[PDB]
Each structure stands twice: as structure tokens, then as C-alpha cells.
């Protein structure tokens, strides 16, 4: 929840789900994974 589509994601940043909707975002420019942050 708390994650509308008012804005897309950041460049060089893939995404992936590791659980029940755990769409953790894959930072490409830095090669890393982080929960919600860029979207919301």
C-alpha cells in the first residue's frame, strides 16, 4: 500500500519482488536492492 503510480521509477534502477509484494528496487548504477523509496 502507500505507492500510487503518480511517478515512474528512477533511471538505472530495476525492480523485483522478494515476498508478498516485496517489490524491492534493484539499483543498477550502484548494483544494490532496497525496499520502497524511489517510487513513493
Amino acid at each position: 500500500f502507500e505507492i500510487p503510480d503518480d511517478v515512474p521509477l528512477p533511471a538505472g534502477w530495476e525492480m523485483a519482488k522478494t515476498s508478498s509484494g516485496q517489490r524491492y528496487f534493484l539499483n543498477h548504477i550502484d548494483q544494490t536492492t532496497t525496499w520502497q523509496d524511489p517510487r513513493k
Partner: peptide
């Protein structure tokens, strides 16, 4: 615990 890539 951050997930892998």
C-alpha cells in the same frame, strides 16, 4: 535483510 540482485 536486502535481497540479492
Amino acid at each position: 535483510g536486502p535481497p540479492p540482485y
